[PDB]
Symmetry: D2
Subunit: 463 residues, 4 copies
């Protein structure tokens, strides 16, 4: 019973119905103002913004800010994430990660190729395919230049055409025909590029902006080597994604795109050969920084869903997994089922944390996990207060800590300059599991400490 | 320029003007319902409750629930704390702890004795002084009996009459004439009681309920041995507190009280000799449990103010100190001034954390501090999200941790059964200080990453 | 200027000249007595033993116990190791590991094939090739059966015949024609065996006993994948090793052997097809246990030499490396040169320990290192007392510890049952490096604290 | 059945009978040579030295070097300690500490005052009482001046004359009439001196050299406040010590002394008022530095005996305690009895280490213990090799460590400059206890792994 939104226009019409998108008709400068407007929106939990008029390009190309920021919908802060993933506006943190992890146990669904798509209604080729026709937002004061890709998907195939990877990575503008980005060897973009460099040939690419809202979530997901994002998207929604042939390169791109940038990566510079776009195009942006933005609501969230799927595939009794937004995607919380001891009869609390550390260490997400807290499932790790309370009251100030040293996230802040320079530092697994305890010995709150007739009577007097 | 509220009636009239107190006219049972109503209020950030009609005693004695819970006043969650301490309704976490710590550098102000007070308008003596005339609330399902004192102040003097201690401690009802409580040797009540036991004489006492709202905050404050709470209250408000002579014991009690219970502690049982009360008495309660209640807003908060004063008296450059409510008064956050290196030229980051640990370890609050995080003052430790972000991004997963073993808080949850039974366990000091860094290299947010004209322009478009 | 001993007879004639081998003419039972005689010898630093008469087989096959135990030679406890490696009887711990590590920088020297060898003077084929003709020592009370290989070398080749591995592993007797051993996947024997199992063919093998004394040291050495022990032995001694063709299998074996057991490993059982031996054969044994035996003098020592070579190949300024015998080959000591800061200008003490941990973690010896201590080279890590003094006085009781979790040595004792069962546990790197300090501020001894004329004068009065 | 040696002449006659003292008749310079001769002796395990002829004072006053260094007596390295404490020349480490700890459970024995003593055969008063008559040894190149007291005992009484403390502390010569030393407030000399400073009066003192050999051991012992060393010595030997009245001060001094220096400590300088000595006086020295000297054989050893007595007084099942000489008196080893679980039924291994840490932390020796290792009593902590093997194989590389921060030993080397400057740093308790295990699963050696008839048979063949 999924409610898949098929393009960005549908996504925006749903947000508009819930009063969660605002149109700005006054001119906004892509030089710092658009980025500042996005930050204000994330930090104040404002509606997503449609910037209808940008200095330099006017009303030609709109900008969507905070596409998956925290929502204004009352009682539903995850509504943009939930709607993007075809779920109810009020889907909980656990329902979201559980729906993604459930799709990892399903067979991939091959996409379908359509003859035409709105993303090719306007086609710019040759000298007309120039990025100077579109906004070039300078998102933060100290950036090296305009970041053209922050929320769009980069599409590349291996030379044999047997495998296609979709990924979100930052791409900076050099000039009207050229862009650049960093190609990390631990990422699938970098791995695929090394195959094109070995054959001494430019790698064809496509960057798509403003696709259906579910695509950037799966493009940020650290799926295993050899699992295509498009097949996973298909298994997740229970139907094939519709793709259209790119105009100047042998690649298939989402037919739901607002804009398609096509070209080749030279031996690392992206060279633009064609730009295609649908009428009145919308270019979404994501302005990374402190909590809470799409680094947290999309990347950290889909990473938690992948961790949940990997831990369950190792037969661990994991109720849920979550990357708390307030910890800026530095932490993973792993919650065990109440009956984990019945399910894993041979391990102590320390033993199951050792096992979790061993399983996570064998995966491609292990370097991101600066800290993993292992807790009981009477804690909602998406509830900031309950999570902080559980860590303070259940994790020993000294013991129950398992430290591993190895590869680290170079963007994580909790490392010394020497650890960053070596790319070698500590990652911890912290044990916050309790011994077997009665509910009333580990809780003291309205829901957990009073009989149902007493709570009912209080609710009738006060609610 | 203090705005001291002189009794509970004034406090309640101020909360009523800000729509932060609600009257419940339907009957409420002191058997679990009153406690459940208090928990619902804390956990939902509801108005303080005036329970006007209690099963068993009717409308005789009202109950005030959540006297200093988080406020409903828009943008002012600490308003009940701020008003209780004579400050503006919108006083910040830092203004509150700074006002308390500033009073620790001032000379005590002796109280004044008045001939009469509303708290003695009604006097019950002999067989009439029976607690069965007042509500006996069973605050939580598993409690040993009714907790008569949770927010009132216990008053005792040393045998020589040279020193008087005011403290909040829990007192349980045994029957109509007798109550009990635990007398901890590390607390001033217990220390004073041991002096009365050495002379083989019953210790006279008084318990006051519903005094002016500033008294329970100073009665929860862990002031040094030999500093009277009444003298500190006087220095804090800049004027003498008015006291009245108790009717059957040689003690002075706050003239602002709603109820006064007088008696002697026998060799530990409290025996009631007299009960005095003002017309239409109000008996406030505090229902301890998970965050956020007065364990956090009063006890942890005044403990943070005492830590701030002790650290500043040791000439440490401490900007602020705070006990985060979400960590259930298990954690202390110490924020250093931006120029701490200029103020302490001979210490590294590790060195200043060593010094903080050494100073705190010599004080009477050291056993409460399961964790102390040392951070820079660009972090507001009362902001849940910014605090969690600073810890995740600035505290190493492995290093910068100073562990001390010793006396522990027996109520803290993060200890093993063996550590609790021995009263011996770990307490940590964690270093989250940064090396010297430019604002734009340690922050990425609206306020810190954009020029003032860009922010102004965004505020005019969106706010 | 090597002094290579070409067979076991030469090795024994050299030990006899230094009164470091004793002949036992009384009968000794291979059932526990031979093993007990070996343990007494290791633990009392006795001469190596030649057991001339064994219960069951008489004077047919002699047994050599403690072949490389600590020596009785005055002032030369490492003499058996030094002589085995072609060095002077008085070669120091550092000269030994440095000579082995220097050979890792040299090109391999291919062996030479000889037409005949003393190891084939007697040939047993078919039903005559029966292990019941030779001693079957039960080395420890609780062993599963007789350990036939403890100091001999197992020789196997890959199916293509392109690579030959020589290794010491324990082999237990089942009966007269069959033996067994554990084939670990991290070891080259196990890796080569998996290639024979994939082709569905029995793996040919040879076990050689009593070769020239340098071979078991290189057969215990954890050389990288693809480096043949025979080529390394050749580079080490500066000349080709002489090999002879095995009688029933297509393998080349050391011509210096006392006994050659040939056969095939079935899908894990070793099946004996031929036994060849020189007149009056000697079967050496190694009886593993507490310090000090060949587990320590050979395996831990050659592992320290390989660590020294790997650290120097990563351009680290390592003066020496050593596995202290008293720590039962659980610890590695890494000593940095006095001018390491001049050689590595960009790292602090913590930084260089991080780098050492990172380099060691990428090697095949990392799981053996339960602890690595990083020290200055004013400490001789082969001097028990000076080493214990340096650790106690230079390693912080709390900080300077880098913990990594991963694969562990299943035979190491410092792990819990859960860590052993998972094969996952902690390994530490401890920083004992000093800040820049004058000799007289870090030492207080005869050699370091008195002027040369004062020491000379004292030596003339006392020595 | 004690064999108490009543003076230094008897001690030296016993060492001479065991060929453990050597006379040097050639002249030796007290400027560095005597100290260098002492260091050579400790480090080479040489006989104690009698320096019969010193440059500057000739044959007047002899010097005894290495009075309690490791002995040359075959198989009896602790013989100087054992003889000093009235025990058999072959008394083990455990017999020594057990004999000292047993005396802590006995009532003190008051001394007896004798009318005359050999230490007053020669009396120097007034201007004749000049230290320039005796050697002034410069013990190490960088010392501030000559150390006149290194092995003698400082005697002081409280102003009321109710308590007398005997202690070894270093005393440096200023000139012929004046000396100086540091008066630490945690030591009994410093505490007693503060009482004399409060009354504004010079503290009378006496320094005795060359007393009976048991006195410097008890003078180095950190006995509790209010326990006199003389009473303990009396309880230890089972008889009263004989004291003689000092000539110019109201103090009692050992009648067995070689030299007595009397005077007053001025407001810290020692001023000499009288020197008394027996014919042909001997002035013993102790030259502190690296292991092994009297810092280790006396101070660390008697500290281990006091720890054993304190742990047993807290009803802990401690088999033995020892301060390993190789760890330079930085470490304490605590060995529990094999049946400790039967004796302490309610604690886990971690629990008993917590308890040991808690008990030790309440004592006056806690700051000296940089590390405490808790082990089973199948380990002899005085056996260097077995101790290193037990720590390497039984202490986890990561867990089982209890860190406490507090007062530290300013002379300990394992602290940073900031920890030393603050006098605040880490002290650890490490858990090396095993779970219940069969002897053959935790040992592998001659004594533990072979049946008694097999060992007997091997001993008859080899010993
Ligand atoms: C807003 C946003 C921006 C991102 N930017 C980057 C980036 O510049 N580089 C990068 O390596 N990963 C970035 N990621 C994370 C990757 O998309 C993620 O690691 C993904 O799994 C990569 O695809 P792959 O698993 O096929 O290699 C970003 C994610 C989000 C949501
Ligand atoms: C709601 C509330 C209840 C409290 N209950 C107790 C209690 O039962 N026992 C206790 O020792 N401290 C309790 N405290 C903390 C003490 O009031 C606090 O330690 C105070 O400083 C004690 O007074 P003293 O410093 O004069 O010893 C409570 C505090 C609050 C705010
Ligand atoms: C006395 C002795 C016995 C040994 N027994 C074993 C054994 O049974 N199994 C094992 O894996 N390694 C054992 N080793 C260690 C291996 O020989 C060593 O890991 C060697 O490097 C293996 O050869 P490879 O590096 O070619 O895999 C022993 C070493 C010595 C000196
Ligand atoms: C060779 C030697 C020299 C010593 N020198 C000193 C010293 O200079 N200062 C000191 O405080 N303790 C020194 N000690 C240790 C003290 O004697 C020891 O702490 C003793 O218990 C002090 O006496 P008290 O317990 O009565 O205070 C020395 C011990 C020995 C054996
Ligand atoms: Mn991918
Ligand atoms: Mn008080
Ligand atoms: Mn090999
Ligand atoms: Mn004393």
């Amino acid at each position: 019973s999924m409610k898949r939104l098929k393009d960005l226009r549908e996504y925006l019409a749903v947000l508009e119905a819930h009063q969660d998108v605002r149109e700005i008709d006054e001119p906004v400068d892509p030089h710092l103002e658009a980025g500042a407007a996005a930050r204000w929106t994330y930090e104040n939990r404002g509606p997503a913004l449609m910037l209808n008029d940008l200095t330099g390009t006017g009303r030609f190309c709109r900008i969507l800010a905070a596409p998956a920021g925290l929502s204004t919908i009352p009682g539903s802060p995850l509504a943009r994430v939930a709607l993007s993933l075809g779920l109810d506006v009020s889907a909980t943190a656990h329902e979201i990660v559980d729906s993604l992890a459930a799709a990892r146990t399903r067979e991939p669904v091959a996409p379908v190729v359509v003859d035409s798509a709105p993303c090719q209604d306007n086609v710019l080729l040759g000298d007309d395919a120039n990025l100077d026709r579109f906004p070039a937002p300078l998102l933060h004061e100290g950036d090296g230049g305009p970041y053209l890709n922050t929320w769009g998907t980069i599409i590349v195939s291996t030379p044999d055409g047997s495998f296609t990877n979709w990924a979100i990575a930052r791409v900076m503008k050099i000039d009207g025909k050229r862009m650049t980005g960093t190609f990390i060897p631990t990422q699938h973009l970098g791995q695929i590029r090394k195959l094109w460099d070995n054959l001494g040939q430019p790698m064809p690419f496509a960057i798509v902006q403003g696709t259906e809202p579910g695509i950037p979530f799966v493009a940020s997901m650290p799926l295993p080597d050899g699992i295509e994002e498009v097949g996973f998207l298909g298994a997740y929604f229970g139907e094939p994604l519709e793709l259209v042939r790119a105009k100047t390169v042998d690649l298939l791109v989402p037919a739901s795109a607002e804009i398609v940038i096509e070209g080749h990566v030279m031996p690392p510079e992206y060279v633009v050969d064609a730009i295609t776009y649908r009428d009145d195009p919308i270019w979404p942006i994501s302005v990374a920084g402190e909590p809470v933005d799409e680094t947290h609501t999309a990347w950290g969230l889909v990473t938690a869903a992948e961790a949940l799927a990997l831990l369950r595939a190792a037969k661990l009794p994991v109720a849920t997994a979550w990357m708390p937004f307030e910890a800026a995607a530095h932490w993973l919380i792993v919650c065990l089922t109440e009956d984990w001891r019945e399910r894993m009869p041979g391990l102590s609390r320390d033993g199951i944390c050792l096992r979790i550390s061993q399983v996570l260490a064998a995966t491609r997400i292990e370097a991101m996990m600066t800290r993993v807290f292992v807790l009981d499932d009477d804690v909602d790790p998406s509830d900031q207060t309950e999570l902080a309370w559980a860590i303070a009251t259940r994790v020993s100030p000294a013991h129950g800590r398992l430290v591993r040293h190895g590869m680290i996230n170079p963007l994580a802040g909790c490392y010394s300059a020497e650890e960053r320079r070596l790319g070698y530092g500590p990652k911890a697994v912290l044990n916050g599991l309790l011994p077997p305890m009665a509910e009333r010995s580990r809780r003291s709150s309205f829901r957990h400490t009073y009989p149902e007739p007493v709570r009912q009577r209080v609710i009738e007097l006060l609610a």
